[PDB]
Amino acid sequence: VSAVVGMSLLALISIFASCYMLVAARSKCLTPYALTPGAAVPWTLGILCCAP
């Protein structure tokens, strides 16, 4: 029981950390385009990441 609980917890924290850091990478790649007045994100980068 203890081993299963520990393994599940470790898998969950690994998945969460990976997802959060990938989200951070997205948000840091697409952060300057929201600050530039006018202009627009390229369609390719706006497809490989969801760009509002």
Partner 1 sequence: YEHSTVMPNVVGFPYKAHIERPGYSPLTLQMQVVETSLEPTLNLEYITCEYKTVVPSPYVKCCGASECSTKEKPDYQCKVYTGVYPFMWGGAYCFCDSENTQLSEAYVDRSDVCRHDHASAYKAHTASLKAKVRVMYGNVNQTVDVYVNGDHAVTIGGTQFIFGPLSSAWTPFDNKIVVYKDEVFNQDFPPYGSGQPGRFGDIQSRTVESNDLYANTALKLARPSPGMVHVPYTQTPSGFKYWLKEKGTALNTKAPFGCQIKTNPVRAMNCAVGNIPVSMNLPDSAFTRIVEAPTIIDLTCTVATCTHSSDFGGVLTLTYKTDKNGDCSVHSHSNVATLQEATAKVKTAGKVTLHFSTASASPSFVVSLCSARATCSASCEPPKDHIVPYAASHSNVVFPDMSGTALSWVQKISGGLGAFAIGAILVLVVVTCIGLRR
Q: Which of residues 4-43 bind partner 1 (CB under 8 A)?
A: 7, 11, 14-15, 17-18, 21-22, 24-25, 28-29
Q: Are 29 and 49 in contact (CB under 8 A)?
A: yes
Distant-in-sequence contacts of 35-39, Cβ < 8 A, 24+ apart:
none
Q: How far is the CB of 40 from partner 1 (least distance, A)?
A: 18
Site size for partner 1, by CB under 8 A? 12
Query: Rounded to an integer, what distance in angstroms lies between the CA atom of residue 39 and that of residue 50?
Result: 17
Q: Interface residues with partner 1 (CB under 8 A)?
A: 7, 11, 14-15, 17-18, 21-22, 24-25, 28-29
